[PDB]
Amino acid sequence: DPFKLAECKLAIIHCAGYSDPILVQTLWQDIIEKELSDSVTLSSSDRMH
């Protein structure tokens, strides 16, 4: 959390067997909108890929 490693947060709670559906959906948004954020320098076909 202090570094916001969402791709590690999801692995921790999978390994720990703990599943709040709200946290899990929040982590998939944190992952999707970071991959959408940091890919902004690139064309739509490239960002789809």
Binding site: D1, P2, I12, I13, A16, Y18
Partner: peptide, 19 residues
């Protein structure tokens, strides 16, 4: 340990020097 505990109420700030 395998048992997770959330405690957002007290964290060190990642994004800072130490005092």
């Amino acid at each position: 340990i395998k048992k997770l505990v959330l405690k957002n109420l007290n964290n060190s700030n990642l994004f800072s020097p130490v005092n």
